[PDB]
């Protein structure tokens, strides 16, 4: 096959590039939460 192979390396491209910016979610964002109700819990 040579044609679902297209679906292979594209996921090998896409998902890793899709894996990317969630490191900034781990990276960028003491206090975290500011609501009067949120601190009741």
């Amino acid at each position: 096959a040579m044609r679902i192979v297209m679906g292979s390396w594209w996921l090998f491209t896409l998902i890793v590039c899709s894996s990317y910016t969630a490191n900034l979610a781990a990276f960028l964002t003491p206090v975290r939460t500011f609501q009067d109700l949120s601190k009741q819990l």
Partner: peptide, 29 residues
Amino acid sequence: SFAGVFCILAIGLLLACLVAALELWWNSN
């Protein structure tokens, strides 16, 4: 992202159908 594989999927199924179309060209000839 939510639909990154979705938009490319039907493109791949279009590319999937050309192979079996040439195999029906073989089933005719």
